[PDB]
Amino acid sequence: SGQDLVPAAVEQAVPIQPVAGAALAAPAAGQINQIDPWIFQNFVQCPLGEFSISPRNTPGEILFDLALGPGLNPYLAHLSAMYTGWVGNMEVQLVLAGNAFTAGKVVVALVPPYFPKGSLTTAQITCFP
Amino acid sequence: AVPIQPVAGAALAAPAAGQINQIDPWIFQNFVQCPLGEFSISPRNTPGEILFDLALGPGLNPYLAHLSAMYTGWVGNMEVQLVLAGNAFTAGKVVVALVPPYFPKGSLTTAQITCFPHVMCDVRTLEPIQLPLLDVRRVLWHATQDQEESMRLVCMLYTPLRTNSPGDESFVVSGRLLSKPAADFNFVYLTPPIERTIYRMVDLPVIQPRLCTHARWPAPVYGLLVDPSLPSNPQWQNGRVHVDGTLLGTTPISGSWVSCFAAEAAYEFQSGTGEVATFTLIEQDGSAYVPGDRAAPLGYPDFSGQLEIEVQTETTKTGDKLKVTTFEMILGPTTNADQAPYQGRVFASVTAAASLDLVDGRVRAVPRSIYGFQDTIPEYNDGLLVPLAPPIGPFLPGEVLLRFRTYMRQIDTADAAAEAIDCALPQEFVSWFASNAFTVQSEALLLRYRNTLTGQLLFECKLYNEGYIALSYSGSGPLTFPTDGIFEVVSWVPRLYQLASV
Amino acid sequence: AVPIQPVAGAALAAPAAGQINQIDPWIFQNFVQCPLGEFSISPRNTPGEILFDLALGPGLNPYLAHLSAMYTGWVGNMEVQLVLAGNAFTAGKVVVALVPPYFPKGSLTTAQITCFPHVMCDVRTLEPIQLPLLDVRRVLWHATQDQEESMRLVCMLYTPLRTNSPGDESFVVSGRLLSKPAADFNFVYLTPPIERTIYRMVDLPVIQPRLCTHARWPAPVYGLLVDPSLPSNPQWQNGRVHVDGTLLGTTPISGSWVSCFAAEAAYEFQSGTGEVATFTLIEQDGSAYVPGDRAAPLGYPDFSGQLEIEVQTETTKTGDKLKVTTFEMILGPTTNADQAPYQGRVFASVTAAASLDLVDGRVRAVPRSIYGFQDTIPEYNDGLLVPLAPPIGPFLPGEVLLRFRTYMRQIDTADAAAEAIDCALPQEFVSWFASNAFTVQSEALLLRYRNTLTGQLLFECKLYNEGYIALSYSGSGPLTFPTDGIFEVVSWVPRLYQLASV
Amino acid sequence: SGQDLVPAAVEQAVPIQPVAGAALAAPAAGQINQIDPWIFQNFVQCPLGEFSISPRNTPGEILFDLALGPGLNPYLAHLSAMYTGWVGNMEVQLVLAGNAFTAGKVVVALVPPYFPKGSLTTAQITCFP
Ligand SMILES: C[C@H](CCC(=O)NCCS(=O)(=O)O)[C@H]1CC[C@H]2[C@@H]3[C@H](O)C[C@@H]4C[C@H](O)CC[C@]4(C)[C@H]3C[C@H](O)[C@]12C
Ligand SMILES: C[C@H](CCC(=O)NCCS(=O)(=O)O)[C@H]1CC[C@H]2[C@@H]3[C@H](O)C[C@@H]4C[C@H](O)CC[C@]4(C)[C@H]3C[C@H](O)[C@]12C
């Protein structure tokens, strides 16, 4: 083990307020619906959760682009065949722990809804949290 | 004042937006004018007229219409105020009603306007009527980049206007609506600013018309003029476009495609009047042409007469290989012509005495001159269907088209006066409007011809959102304008907006 | 940290501004990237290189560059931070210095960069170097619509970079500058938003090149391609423009003016090889032409060969009045030609056997075909001066011009292969850039050819602010691209920005 | 960043007393002369302030040799055209921060006045502070 690496990229205070989950949609669905309290307890790998940065990539390439949903969890992508609806936030871990000799930086943004899909150049991915 | 509950703005939309973004506190101070928020009540109006009808958004304020490209959403109320310009000797009322964000459409009679939460204002009030514009909605917030259904203010003439009038003007009572954000307007989520928004006013190219290019015949533009004598409602097929960026008929993007066609060379000799080639038309970009919405391939001539294409002739006869001969084509009916560009076939005839050993290939044609030119639709089909652009109208009483006359190469045998073809929009505007693809706000722009050197107006014309310019002319003689100015968009007007007489 | 006093922002400018306008408090939260604030330190760089040089303003932030059209002025500091991408095994420093708002120009050696208030950053630092950008000024506030002298950040390579490198890539240490407003940034006076500002990025027309029109010969554009074989630095005179809206040479606005001239008809018969007309050239808009900066009137052909204008012939001989004959003109020297368009005279010769009774008037000429076409400057003067546009360069090592080839009507007697004339910018961009008149930020745009249907790149080219496109090609064979995509401006780059190999 | 390097070569207690600067020459010049208090506030690179150690150098080579003066400062080498005289100490920073793989040691001495110039072998450069 050696600490000639970066210790931790501790989530900066991203400029965003807290958002309500199932507390807004609860008096508008006609059921009491809860999911296993053990699904909230471990981080399991996404269905689309595998990328790679080679040195043939250029600045601006989009490494991953995944919309908040139940498609971000093998558990909830399976539970979401029985239900019609969802609300709430998710917590994502990003595991890049490259060699001690590599160098480079990725930037992970928080693109809001209704923002046009497509290009999203490198000059404008920083204007988001 | 008005029978509505108070409507929560940014307090209902807060627990579900990443951010709630504040606005400069100096914007909640000024009453800025609403676009299309002006009217005028003449004593010839019948009660029931709808003076204005404008929907709550950020498009009502130039500050917010510009701030609303940095953000994703908005929520909240606005304060509007209606000012009326009438003295103590007028008489008449005006009912301003808050229409909910549904309630479809149709003639609202004055019986029905008083059924909404409304305010009934006498014409002879002093201080401006202030009234709210609440955000009644089904959703938490609104999206700035997608026009949605929000509360309208509709103004209607309740009882008519009773005044005297000297001899001119006829005393119209004017009125203007001015709005500002309420204390709880908010945008939602800071995005990177985009330029192709929807509250982006139509701007025009800064190019004098003399430097432009014509749309129906490939030549410069030599004079813009009004002319109450010619057919007031023509049906041209080139130089037709919508201000929202939609090409109408056989109008091409480029100006090289005008009065031209790329065809298939099908050559064969004949011992009659000369050589005759049948051309299988295609689109000049090289894409397979099929009979569709247009009355001909893109750019095919829209006039009637004797046109003469040139070539692409490869001759295998010894002495020369590639030459430039002049064919001949008839555009008018003449009661003897198999002219059907619609289906993709045209007939060209040169008067040759021997055989021209011409290889069959792919050619494209360039006009040389015209003989017997008539401003009249050609034969896109023999006597058959032509899905074509409608005529160029209608105009208000006392408004005449503004034509961009150029002069085409005439083959004549009786006179020498140059003939004038003309279009409604030079080929620079046809490319501008298509490349920008603006958002049409109401019905008609309001241009303003100015002189760049002097700095004085020449006239105020009106660009209809259908792609032609009108102009309120009274006289009868062709009045020609200078061709060294600049068109400048002022604002959006309704159809019935009456110009100033030129 | 840095040896500067604290600089008062909006407290010095307050008693003399009508308003002091606040900014959304969510803009003081994010570090947004600065335009042109990126570099890369290779191990082949010598100390003294200037990696970036950027001036305090509102042009450093996309939020403020957009908010700064609603207002008149600004004041205050910014916070910038430099991130560097290097591991523990690199070695090298970088000095970031605060240059005052004067101190003219020139090669700043590394001896002199350490004399400003600076910060010396090792390449192998972890957390981003944060440093201020104060507003040192002579005046109370600044005007947003007038670039002025404000404090710069200049970054210089102090000691060189010592690392290993596998075989590819060569380990460049990248770095990026990101800024946000300090706690006391303010705009001054709310005006109505204007669209023709100075922080308005260059946008391109949304038009596929196949739909465009050529700039040197009046025809459509049939293929864009690179070609390392032809003259790498041509000296064309049509299709030359500056991205800041300045027409270079004999480039016209319109596409109808290309390879054309309006001339004075001076007709007289001669019993030699035929009829010969001397033309007194004028500007096609009808304005009196005088020898000036251009090498010929606006639009006169810029190729060399045997061109054949058409007419404006009015014949008073009985039988016909207005016809279309084909003259002939020589553009190359041929060692026997009085070709001087510069002074306003050209010679045209048709091979006639009898007298053509042609009235003297005002004509204008249209090309018909070319014989013996050579990509070489014609004789604008006999052997005399020609104030002309410079060649098209220079390019970096391994970059070749991107040409918009069209095919002109060839008169041939030995073969049939179509010849390709080509320009650097189709005639739609020449009108776009002139009608908008953008503000050039640094040295070269960075376009991006995409496909509208699929949605995948084709190449990344580079539009130099001198009006031509370059492209980093390695091979030697002419590589032709599809002509159905869209050019998309990405950002401003320096000259030395190295493209990605196509 | 990595700390498989040497943290800091913090100036050892070099055996030398403090020396008086302008307090001795003040009652012997007929003027009150002060220099900008901001020139004392940042370290700027010497006029002769650039050397390099290659592996072709041998132990004993003199990397730099710079006499105390106003020639050690671009600021004071410019101010010293208006005056005839000077006194006082200077503070010098030495920036060698070589790669993590290099190895070697330099020794910086404090040679007094009147010491003969010339050879200064490696056996005797350590006899100085
Ligand atoms: C016959 C064309 C030569 C140009 C010409 O004859 N006149 C140009 C001026 S004018 O309008 O006649 O006035 C040749 C040269 C360029 C050719 C075209 C180009 O090769 C582009 C496509 C390529 C496709 O394979 C075939 C159709 C095509 C669309 C070709 C049609 C035709 O063979 C063209 C148009
Ligand atoms: C000879 C012109 C007729 C048009 C023509 O011959 N060909 C058009 C197509 S092409 O390019 O030849 O290919 C005539 C009709 C329009 C005329 C022009 C127009 O009258 C506009 C100005 C008016 C000025 O009084 C005289 C110069 C002028 C500039 C005229 C020159 C010339 O008499 C023109 C240009």
Side-chain angles (χ1 to χ4, degrees):
Chain A
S1 185
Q3 319 293 34
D4 50 8
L5 268 68
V6 179
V10 57
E11 71 209 274
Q12 318 316 308
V14 310
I16 207 167
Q17 288 167 175
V19 186
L24 296 190
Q31 290 198 159
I32 292 179
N33 276 305
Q34 296 166 35
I35 66 178
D36 190 353
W38 288 101
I39 292 190
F40 303 98
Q41 304 263 298
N42 77 320
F43 278 98
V44 302
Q45 174 198 342
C46 286
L48 262 74
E50 183 168 357
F51 64 88
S52 78
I53 323 165
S54 65
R56 286 173 174 153
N57 282 173
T58 82
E61 308 266 21
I62 284 180
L63 262 38
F64 71 81
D65 173 328
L66 49 88
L68 171 84
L72 301 197
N73 204 352
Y75 288 143
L76 312 164
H78 185 264
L79 287 194
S80 80
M82 329 197 301
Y83 307 94
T84 97
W86 56 267
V87 281
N89 326 128
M90 300 200 79
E91 312 163 355
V92 182
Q93 266 191 354
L94 172 73
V95 176
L96 35 81
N99 211 350
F101 288 100
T102 52
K105 294 209 181 313
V106 291
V107 55
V108 184
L110 270 183
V111 172
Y114 312 110
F115 189 76
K117 295 169 186 276
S119 66
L120 195 59
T121 65
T122 173
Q124 90 190 9
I125 206 184
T126 47
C127 299
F128 301 111
Chain B
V2 171
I4 303 195
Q5 296 171 346
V7 188
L12 184 76
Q19 318 168 7
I20 289 294
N21 275 285
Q22 283 151 45
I23 304 174
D24 193 8
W26 284 106
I27 294 189
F28 309 83
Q29 305 282 119
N30 223 30
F31 270 96
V32 193
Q33 195 188 337
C34 280
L36 299 157
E38 69 207 17
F39 62 78
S40 92
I41 318 162
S42 164
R44 302 273 298 160
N45 287 9
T46 71
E49 299 266 7
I50 290 179
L51 302 164
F52 62 73
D53 170 322
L54 50 85
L56 155 71
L60 295 186
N61 208 332
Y63 295 93
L64 311 172
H66 182 262
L67 281 195
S68 89
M70 288 156 50
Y71 301 101
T72 295
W74 56 273
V75 281
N77 310 120
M78 297 184 101
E79 320 196 89
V80 310
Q81 95 179 355
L82 166 80
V83 317
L84 279 153
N87 46 8
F89 307 98
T90 63
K93 285 189 165 66
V94 160
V95 54
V96 188
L98 283 89
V99 178
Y102 288 107
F103 174 79
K105 270 318 169 295
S107 176
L108 267 178
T109 83
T110 51
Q112 308 179 358
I113 194 82
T114 44
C115 285
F116 298 103
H118 65 270
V119 165
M120 195 173 309
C121 326
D122 214 330
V123 153
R124 57 193 171 186
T125 53
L126 266 177
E127 51 166 321
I129 320 295
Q130 186 147 330
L131 72 156
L133 187 47
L134 291 307
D135 198 38
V136 172
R137 49 192 202 285
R138 300 193 303 170
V139 288
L140 291 179
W141 36 273
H142 298 268
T144 47
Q145 292 301 133
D146 166 56
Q147 199 79 3
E148 214 190 333
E149 275 269 25
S150 39
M151 165 153 301
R152 320 217 295 278
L153 267 180
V154 176
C155 209
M156 169 159 307
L157 181 59
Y158 197 45
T159 77
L161 180 83
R162 312 289 191 202
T163 65
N164 313 270
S165 316
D168 47 343
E169 69 183 18
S170 161
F171 192 68
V172 311
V173 164
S174 313
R176 305 271 188 284
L177 206 81
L178 328 173
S179 57
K180 88 198 194 187
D184 64 350
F185 198 93
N186 277 123
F187 300 97
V188 154
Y189 198 101
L190 261 172
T191 79
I194 45 187
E195 312 87 335
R196 297 293 187 80
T197 64
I198 74 186
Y199 317 105
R200 196 257 313 258
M201 176 69 66
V202 174
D203 61 61
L204 281 191
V206 173
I207 285 178
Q208 291 153 339
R210 67 167 60 204
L211 289 156
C212 276
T213 168
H214 208 257
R216 298 176 70 194
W217 183 270
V221 163
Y222 298 111
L224 68 97
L225 57 88
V226 297
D227 172 71
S229 315
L230 257 62
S232 290
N233 292 37
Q235 296 189 1
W236 306 325
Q237 300 280 139
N238 287 265
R240 312 291 306 281
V241 77
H242 272 306
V243 190
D244 67 270
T246 298
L247 297 169
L248 289 192
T250 46
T251 303
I253 288 288
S254 175
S256 42
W257 292 26
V258 169
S259 166
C260 172
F261 52 83
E264 207 69 12
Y267 278 114
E268 205 174 332
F269 183 57
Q270 180 258 12
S271 195
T273 81
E275 164 62 37
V276 159
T278 193
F279 288 125
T280 290
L281 297 190
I282 51 184
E283 279 303 335
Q284 303 182 3
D285 61 357
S287 200
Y289 161 56
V290 302
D293 191 354
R294 312 160 313 283
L298 276 178
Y300 193 90
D302 70 275
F303 36 84
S304 59
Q306 289 199 17
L307 174 147
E308 40 266 24
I309 85 163
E310 309 284 351
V311 282
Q312 173 34 45
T313 63
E314 164 168 5
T315 298
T316 178
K317 152 188 55 183
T318 299
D320 48 16
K321 184 69 69 68
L322 318 177
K323 42 161 92 173
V324 174
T325 53
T326 292
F327 282 91
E328 208 276 338
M329 184 175 292
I330 182 64
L331 298 178
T334 58
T335 324
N336 195 326
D338 196 350
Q339 296 285 22
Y342 188 112
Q343 281 88 30
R345 273 171 289 98
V346 199
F347 284 178
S349 89
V350 73
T351 316
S355 198
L356 278 70
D357 317 283
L358 310 153
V359 192
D360 268 20
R362 284 183 283 264
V363 306
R364 71 177 296 278
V366 193
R368 191 162 148 102
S369 184
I370 210 74
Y371 179 80
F373 156 85
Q374 294 181 358
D375 201 77
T376 291
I377 324 173
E379 276 64 23
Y380 298 96
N381 223 349
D382 314 62
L384 303 192
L385 88 164
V386 276
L388 80 171
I392 291 183
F395 306 83
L396 298 180
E399 292 193 353
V400 59
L401 180 53
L402 181 134
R403 313 151 192 266
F404 289 94
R405 260 169 180 171
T406 194
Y407 302 92
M408 40 208 295
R409 270 170 289 170
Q410 182 172 17
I411 281 184
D412 212 357
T413 53
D415 205 280
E419 66 182 353
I421 200 175
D422 50 353
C423 48
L425 280 191
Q427 195 60 32
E428 318 292 359
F429 299 182
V430 175
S431 175
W432 193 262
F433 288 145
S435 193
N436 290 80
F438 299 109
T439 309
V440 58
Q441 297 294 156
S442 84
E443 271 163 311
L445 280 301
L446 173 55
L447 310 181
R448 217 163 74 171
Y449 205 59
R450 259 204 284 172
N451 203 329
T452 311
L453 288 199
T454 68
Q456 63 150 9
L457 268 64
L458 299 206
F459 54 95
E460 282 203 312
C461 64
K462 186 194 280 183
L463 180 77
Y464 287 92
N465 67 318
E466 312 165 289
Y468 61 87
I469 309 173
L471 186 48
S472 89
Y473 193 17
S474 201
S476 88
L479 158 63
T480 293
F481 306 96
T483 169
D484 61 346
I486 291 296
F487 285 117
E488 268 156 32
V489 175
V490 169
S491 73
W492 298 90
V493 305
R495 293 189 59 93
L496 273 302
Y497 177 85
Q498 177 79 359
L499 290 187
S501 190
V502 65
Chain C
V2 171
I4 303 195
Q5 296 171 346
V7 188
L12 184 76
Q19 318 168 7
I20 289 294
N21 275 285
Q22 283 151 45
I23 304 174
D24 193 8
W26 284 106
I27 294 189
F28 309 83
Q29 305 282 119
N30 223 30
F31 270 96
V32 193
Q33 195 188 337
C34 280
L36 299 157
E38 69 207 17
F39 62 78
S40 92
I41 318 162
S42 164
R44 302 273 298 160
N45 287 9
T46 71
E49 299 266 7
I50 290 179
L51 302 164
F52 62 73
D53 170 322
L54 50 85
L56 155 71
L60 295 186
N61 208 332
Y63 295 93
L64 311 172
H66 182 262
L67 281 195
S68 89
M70 288 156 50
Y71 301 101
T72 295
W74 56 273
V75 281
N77 310 120
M78 297 184 101
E79 320 196 89
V80 310
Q81 95 179 355
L82 166 80
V83 317
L84 279 153
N87 46 8
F89 307 98
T90 63
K93 285 189 165 66
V94 160
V95 54
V96 188
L98 283 89
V99 178
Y102 288 107
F103 174 79
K105 270 318 169 295
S107 176
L108 267 178
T109 83
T110 51
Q112 308 179 358
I113 194 82
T114 44
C115 285
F116 298 103
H118 65 270
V119 165
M120 195 173 309
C121 326
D122 214 330
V123 153
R124 57 193 171 186
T125 53
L126 266 177
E127 51 166 321
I129 320 295
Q130 186 147 330
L131 72 156
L133 187 47
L134 291 307
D135 198 38
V136 172
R137 49 192 202 285
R138 300 193 303 170
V139 288
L140 291 179
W141 36 273
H142 298 268
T144 47
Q145 292 301 133
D146 166 56
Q147 199 79 3
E148 214 190 333
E149 275 269 25
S150 39
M151 165 153 301
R152 320 217 295 278
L153 267 180
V154 176
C155 209
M156 169 159 307
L157 181 59
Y158 197 45
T159 77
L161 180 83
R162 312 289 191 202
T163 65
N164 313 270
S165 316
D168 47 343
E169 69 183 18
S170 161
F171 192 68
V172 311
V173 164
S174 313
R176 305 271 188 284
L177 206 81
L178 328 173
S179 57
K180 88 198 194 187
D184 64 350
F185 198 93
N186 277 123
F187 300 97
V188 154
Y189 198 101
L190 261 172
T191 79
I194 45 187
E195 312 87 335
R196 297 293 187 80
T197 64
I198 74 186
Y199 317 105
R200 196 257 313 258
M201 176 69 66
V202 174
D203 61 61
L204 281 191
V206 173
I207 285 178
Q208 291 153 339
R210 67 167 60 204
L211 289 156
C212 276
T213 168
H214 208 257
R216 298 176 70 194
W217 183 270
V221 163
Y222 298 111
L224 68 97
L225 57 88
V226 297
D227 172 71
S229 315
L230 257 62
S232 290
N233 292 37
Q235 296 189 1
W236 306 325
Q237 300 280 139
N238 287 265
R240 312 291 306 281
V241 77
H242 272 306
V243 190
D244 67 270
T246 298
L247 297 169
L248 289 192
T250 46
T251 303
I253 288 288
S254 175
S256 42
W257 292 26
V258 169
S259 166
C260 172
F261 52 83
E264 207 69 12
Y267 278 114
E268 205 174 332
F269 183 57
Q270 180 258 12
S271 195
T273 81
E275 164 62 37
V276 159
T278 193
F279 288 125
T280 290
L281 297 190
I282 51 184
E283 279 303 335
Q284 303 182 3
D285 61 357
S287 200
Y289 161 56
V290 302
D293 191 354
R294 312 160 313 283
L298 276 178
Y300 193 90
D302 70 275
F303 36 84
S304 59
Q306 289 199 17
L307 174 147
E308 40 266 24
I309 85 163
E310 309 284 351
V311 282
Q312 173 34 45
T313 63
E314 164 168 5
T315 298
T316 178
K317 152 188 55 183
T318 299
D320 48 16
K321 184 69 69 68
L322 318 177
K323 42 161 92 173
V324 174
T325 53
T326 292
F327 282 91
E328 208 276 338
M329 184 175 292
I330 182 64
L331 298 178
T334 58
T335 324
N336 195 326
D338 196 350
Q339 296 285 22
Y342 188 112
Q343 281 88 30
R345 273 171 289 98
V346 199
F347 284 178
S349 89
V350 73
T351 316
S355 198
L356 278 70
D357 317 283
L358 310 153
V359 192
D360 268 20
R362 284 183 283 264
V363 306
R364 71 177 296 278
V366 193
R368 191 162 148 102
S369 184
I370 210 74
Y371 179 80
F373 156 85
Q374 294 181 358
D375 201 77
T376 291
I377 324 173
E379 276 64 23
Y380 298 96
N381 223 349
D382 314 62
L384 303 192
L385 88 164
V386 276
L388 80 171
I392 291 183
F395 306 83
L396 298 180
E399 292 193 353
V400 59
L401 180 53
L402 181 134
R403 313 151 192 266
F404 289 94
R405 260 169 180 171
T406 194
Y407 302 92
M408 40 208 295
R409 270 170 289 170
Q410 182 172 17
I411 281 184
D412 212 357
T413 53
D415 205 280
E419 66 182 353
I421 200 175
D422 50 353
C423 48
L425 280 191
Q427 195 60 32
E428 318 292 359
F429 299 182
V430 175
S431 175
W432 193 262
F433 288 145
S435 193
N436 290 80
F438 299 109
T439 309
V440 58
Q441 297 294 156
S442 84
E443 271 163 311
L445 280 301
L446 173 55
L447 310 181
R448 217 163 74 171
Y449 205 59
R450 259 204 284 172
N451 203 329
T452 311
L453 288 199
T454 68
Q456 63 150 9
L457 268 64
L458 299 206
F459 54 95
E460 282 203 312
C461 64
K462 186 194 280 183
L463 180 77
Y464 287 92
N465 67 318
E466 312 165 289
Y468 61 87
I469 309 173
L471 186 48
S472 89
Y473 193 17
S474 201
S476 88
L479 158 63
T480 293
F481 306 96
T483 169
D484 61 346
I486 291 296
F487 285 117
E488 268 156 32
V489 175
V490 169
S491 73
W492 298 90
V493 305
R495 293 189 59 93
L496 273 302
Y497 177 85
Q498 177 79 359
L499 290 187
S501 190
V502 65
Chain D
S1 185
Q3 319 293 34
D4 50 8
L5 268 68
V6 179
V10 57
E11 71 209 274
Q12 318 316 308
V14 310
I16 207 167
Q17 288 167 175
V19 186
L24 296 190
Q31 290 198 159
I32 292 179
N33 276 305
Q34 296 166 35
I35 66 178
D36 190 353
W38 288 101
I39 292 190
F40 303 98
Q41 304 263 298
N42 77 320
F43 278 98
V44 302
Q45 174 198 342
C46 286
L48 262 74
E50 183 168 357
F51 64 88
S52 78
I53 323 165
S54 65
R56 286 173 174 153
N57 282 173
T58 82
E61 308 266 21
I62 284 180
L63 262 38
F64 71 81
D65 173 328
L66 49 88
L68 171 84
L72 301 197
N73 204 352
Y75 288 143
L76 312 164
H78 185 264
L79 287 194
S80 80
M82 329 197 301
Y83 307 94
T84 97
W86 56 266
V87 281
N89 326 128
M90 300 200 79
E91 312 163 355
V92 182
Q93 266 191 354
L94 172 73
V95 176
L96 35 81
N99 211 350
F101 288 100
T102 52
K105 294 209 181 313
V106 291
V107 55
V108 184
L110 270 183
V111 172
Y114 312 110
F115 189 76
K117 295 169 186 276
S119 66
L120 195 59
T121 65
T122 173
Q124 90 190 9
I125 206 184
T126 47
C127 299
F128 301 111

